[PDB]
């Protein structure tokens, strides 16, 4: 009967932001709260309290929400698969490969970390090209790498002896599953600064340049359990919840708009990070009337 | 008791460095380098240390810095790879580990103005302006001792802004109240050991954002001098020597 | 067998439910947890680190020439440097800092500020520069006057070439949205104005024109709420 | 004080070329930023170069890029013009000044001191 | 290019008078606007600078201010050598462009 004490503390405890102390005037020398050293590296030392006369302030907000967990346990699209039947492209499946920086939402949070270790649930959002959802069967296998991938609706590697799938209609519940952390590597690794084989880079295209295969997880292969064409297309959105997330070596938030998968190009349009005024002098606000 | 010291002295090996306008050390992360406990270690080869021989302070290039000039990055194990007894323990294992203590040296007249920005970036990944042409090359990549100089600065030539780069450990070379930046980076990888030449851990960067002024007469000509030293260097997997 | 009624909220996909899924690999055991140096637990943690603020951020002005506040001799006395709006989540100066992109994905915050203010000058120019917070209500001050009756710092050049200003936390309510603008001027923060206290002196054979370098950040008492999607990156294709 | 002076004038023929330099003194050379610049007859300026102050940078008009160069020598202290196949539309009164928008200091130097000016006559 | 259009060509005054010559710009150029002064001989010297600041020398006799896209130079009280000639120039955009001259006369 010990687990009556752990069900109780289940519950997001609230950890409050700092407090305020008072603080009255100082005349004096060699005291010198406000004047730093910012070449040292370090941020400014200087608390409210110290450059001006402060009241006592007992502060209740919480600082929950800013968790790393909080900031990233939130579903978010990571890929769109299109299973074509119609017209021509009769082809029943799709193998599609395990890439989570496809979309800017969920790109941009992840690389923020340049090192993350997380486990993941992955839901499937299926329908026709209309939002409807009729009664057909689908099975969404995972191919790890070096399993064989199909090549047709009726391969044999749709018989998942080893290979984990899950088979479910249109018609139901999104499906859901729990994914561990699959990588070699002790974190994945949203940054490479390197080159995945030995050997003289001296390609035209260095398509290799940060290509870390310790990433590279795989394909995800979906079919329509049919026996031939169905005449219909069918879209899959992959959202990706992250759980246990832990994450290293904080880094700058992307500026400029990506433009491929699996590299930081840019345009040679460089954007600011900031919007443009007329003057330095110039601010934005038109308060009340001066009383003078 | 609370404050820091101006002049400094930095030991190690058989190497002896001196400022006497330094501001402070920056520890990066606020950890020290240290070897591979065996709780956090993979291979089963026994690793080479040679202490003294690798671990010394590197005296590597020289950059010229000028009224219009954007800046200069070098990675770290690339840097080092074809100098010394580095350079040849590097070549001859497959896995390597090591930290480093970075410093940077550029001293000016009590006339001259300026600010550099040394930052010390983990996994620095150089990006290509796109109007092949998608992909940078092995130049811009992996530059050696004599650097690249930087393309778009603003961009730290990688699409993240350089007015976040002070999330990274950094320093400023502030041209009336010092002349060097220091920086001791432990080994970061998702990794125990890897290879110092498919692999490059840290970006150096040095990027001047107020440029250097000065008046007629005083000296046109002020250098910027990078000396770095490994750190509790570690190398596996012995075989023949690979220059890639 | 056991009696049960479905209630609504039935077979909905909400994206933001810790719940738990089936595992697609029994008797998993994950690679082993070394030691990497720089583990960030908050996100707050990093908005306490000082970054550059956009400042000079013209029309006209490109790259690294807009992380510059020019400051040069003067032929009047009082007058104005440089003013910028202390709201967090504007479109300006702080979009270019870490609590200014961490803000934009929360959609309400607290807590004091802080403007390091460093001179890159020659070491032989002296000035003394008057660094104001304007609190809300009132416009940008029109004078040095107006400026000096808020909360302000005198700052002198020297040895230590660095100031903070800490704009603290004078607000109607306990939060202030990151939106602004329009009805969301009642979470207006103020303005932030640099006048010049003395002039800028120099002896002869030196430059009569230097820079400020303006890092912002947050102070230890500062919080997020409600998180939120950013408005910062957009996409019309996905990156294939 | 500032002092710009320019030299090297002349008629050119036709598709030909000309050199104009710019003896500089007075201000420290190697941290300014330069530029030439035109007078039309009908008295209308025009940017023709611009040039960083180490000489990396350049900048061209569609009007005459391609055919110009502008050169520095900064232990000389002087500023070049090198000119290319040239027309009557170029007959004019050419300027040294400061300024360029290869610095992050600019724009309080953005043509401060003008020199004295050349003139340059293509025609038969 | 940035097309800038002095609005008067030619004004004639009296010493003494208060005389001010517009400029206005095509597109956003901010604080990027300075003033020029031809002397008969054909010296060039900058008067103002971002519109609103004089350079270390002018008389305070010349102020320069912005009304919208209206970026304006005002002469306060005409001296004598204040008659020559007086250029636009705008360095916001790259093909930095000037104006079209307003030449003062005298009545």
């Known amino acids: 009967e010990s687990a009556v004490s752990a069900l109780a503390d289940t519950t997001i405890s609230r950890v409050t932001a700092a407090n305020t102390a008072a603080s009255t005037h100082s005349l004096g020398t060699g005291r010198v709260p406000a004047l730093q050293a910012a070449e040292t590296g370090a941020s400014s030392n200087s608390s409210d309290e110290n450059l001006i006369e402060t009241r006592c302030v007992m502060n209740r907000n919480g600082v929950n929400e800013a968790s790393v967990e909080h900031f990233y346990s939130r579903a978010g699209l990571v890929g769109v698969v299109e299973v074509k039947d119609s017209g021509t492209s009769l082809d029943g499946y799709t193998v599609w490969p395990i890439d989570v920086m496809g979309f800017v939402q969920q790109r941009r949070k992840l690389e923020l970390s340049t090192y993350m270790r997380f486990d993941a649930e992955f839901t499937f959002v299926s329908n026709l090209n209309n939002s409807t959802t009729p009664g057909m069967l689908l099975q969404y296998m995972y191919v790890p790498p070096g399993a064989p991938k199909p090549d047709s609706r009726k391969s044999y590697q749709w018989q998942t002896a080893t290979n984990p799938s899950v088979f479910a209609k249109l018609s139901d519940p999104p499906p859901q599953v729990s994914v561990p952390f699959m990588s070699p590597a002790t974190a994945y690794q949203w940054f490479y600064d390197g080159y995945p084989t030995f050997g003289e880079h001296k390609q035209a295209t260095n398509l290799q340049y940060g290509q870390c295969p310790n990433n590279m997880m795989g394909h995800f292969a979906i079919r329509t359990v049919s026996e031939s064409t169905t005449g219909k297309n069918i879209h899959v959105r992959v959202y990706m919840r992250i759980k246990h997330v832990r994450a290293w070596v904080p880094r700058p938030l992307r500026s400029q708009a990506y433009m491929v998968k699996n590299y930081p190009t840019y345009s040679q349009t460089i954007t600011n990070t900031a919007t443009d005024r007329a003057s330095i002098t110039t601010t934005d606000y038109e308060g009340g009337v001066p009383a003078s | 008791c609370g404050y820091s010291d101006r002049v400094a002295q930095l030991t190690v090996g058989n190497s002896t460095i001196t400022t006497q306008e330094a501001a402070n050390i920056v520890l990066s992360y606020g950890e020290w380098p240290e070897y591979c406990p065996s709780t956090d270690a993979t291979a089963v080869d026994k690793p080479t240390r040679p202490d003294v021989s690798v671990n010394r302070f590197y005296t590597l290039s020289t950059k010229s810095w000028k009224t219009e000039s954007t800046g200069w990055y070098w990675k770290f194990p690339d840097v080092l790879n074809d100098t010394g007894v580095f350079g040849q323990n590097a070549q001859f294992h497959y896995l390597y580990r090591s930290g480093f203590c970075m410093h940077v040296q550029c001293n000016a007249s009590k006339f001259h103005q300026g600010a550099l920005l040394v930052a010390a970036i983990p996994e620095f990944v150089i990006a290509a302006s796109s109007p092949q042409g998608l992909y940078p090359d092995f130049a811009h990549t992996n530059p050696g001792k004599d650097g690249q100089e930087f393309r778009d600065p603003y961009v730290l030539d990688a699409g993240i802004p350089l007015s976040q780069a002070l999330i990274f450990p950094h320093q400023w070379i502030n041209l009336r109240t010092n002349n060097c930046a220091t920086i001791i980076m432990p080994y970061i990888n998702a990794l125990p050991f890897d290879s110092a030449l498919n692999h490059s851990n840290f970006g150096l960067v040095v990027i001047p954002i107020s440029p250097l002024k000065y008046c007629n007469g005083a000296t046109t000509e002020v250098p910027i001098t990078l000396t770095i030293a490994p750190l509790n260097s570690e190398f596996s997997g012995l075989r023949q020597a690979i220059k890639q | 067998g056991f009696p049960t009624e479905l209630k609504p909220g039935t077979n909905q996909f909400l994206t933001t439910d810790d719940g738990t899924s089936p595992p697609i690999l029994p008797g998993f055991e994950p690679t082993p947890l070394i030691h990497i140096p720089g583990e960030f637990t908050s996100l707050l943690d990093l908005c306490q680190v000082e970054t550059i603020l956009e400042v000079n951020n013209t029309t006209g002005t490109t790259g690294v020439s807009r992380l510059l506040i020019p400051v040069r001799a003067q032929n009047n006395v009082d007058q104005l440097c440089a003013s910028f709006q202390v709201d967090p989540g504007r479109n300006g100066p702080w979009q270019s800092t870490m609590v200014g992109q961490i803000c934009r994905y929360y959609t309400q915050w607290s807590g004091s500020l802080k403007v390091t203010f460093m001179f890159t000058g020659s070491f032989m120019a002296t000035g003394k520069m008057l660094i104001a917070y304007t609190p809300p209500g009132s416009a940008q001050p029109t004078t040095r006057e107006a400026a000096m009756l808020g909360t302000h710092i005198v700052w002198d050049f020297g040895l230590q070439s660095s100031v903070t200003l800490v704009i603290p936390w004078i607000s109607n309510t306990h939060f202030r949205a990151v939106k602004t603008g329009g009805v969301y001027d009642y979470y207006a923060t103020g303005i932030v104005t640099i006048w010049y206290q003395t002039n800028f002196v120099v002896p002869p054979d030196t430059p009569t024109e230097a820079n400020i370098i303006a890092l912002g950040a947050a102070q230890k008492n500062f919080t997020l709420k409600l998180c939120k999607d950013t408005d910062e990156i957009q996409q019309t294709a996905e990156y294939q | 004080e500032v002092k710009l002076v320019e030299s090297g004038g002349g008629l050119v023929k036709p598709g030909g070329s000309l050199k104009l330099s710019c003896a500089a003194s007075?201000?420290?050379?190697?941290?300014?930023?330069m530029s030439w610049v035109r007078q039309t007859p009908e008295k209308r300026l025009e940017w023709v170069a611009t040039?960083?102050?180490?000489?990396?940078?350049?900048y061209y008009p569609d009007s005459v890029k391609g055919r110009f160069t502008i050169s520095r020598d900064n232990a000389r202290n002087t500023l070049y013009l090198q000119m290319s196949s040239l027309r009557s539309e170029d007959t004019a009164l050419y300027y040294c000044?400061?300024?360029?928008?290869?610095?992050?200091?600019?724009?309080?130097?953005?043509?401060?001191?003008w020199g004295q000016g050349t003139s340059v006559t293509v025609s038969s | 290019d940035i097309q800038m259009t002095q609005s008067p060509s030619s004004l004639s005054a009296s010493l003494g008078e208060r005389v001010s010559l517009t400029c206005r710009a095509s597109?956003?150029?901010?604080?990027?606007l300075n003033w020029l002064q031809q002397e008969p001989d054909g010296t060039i010297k900058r008067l103002i600078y971002?519109?609103?600041s004089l350079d270390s020398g002018v008389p305070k006799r010349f102020s320069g201010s912005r009304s919208g896209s209206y970026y304006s130079l005002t002469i306060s009280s005409l001296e004598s050598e204040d008659f020559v000639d007086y250029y636009c120039?705008?360095?916001?955009?790259?093909?930095?462009?000037f104006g079209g001259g307003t030449k003062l006369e005298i009545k």
């Open positions: 000044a400061r300024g360029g928008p290869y610095d992050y200091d600019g724009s309080f130097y953005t043509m401060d001191y």
């Open positions: 007075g201000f420290a050379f190697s941290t300014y930023d």
């Open positions: 040039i960083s102050s180490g000489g990396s940078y350049t």
């Open positions: 597109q956003d150029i901010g604080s990027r």
């Open positions: 971002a519109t609103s």
């Open positions: 120039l705008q360095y916001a955009g790259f093909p930095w462009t």
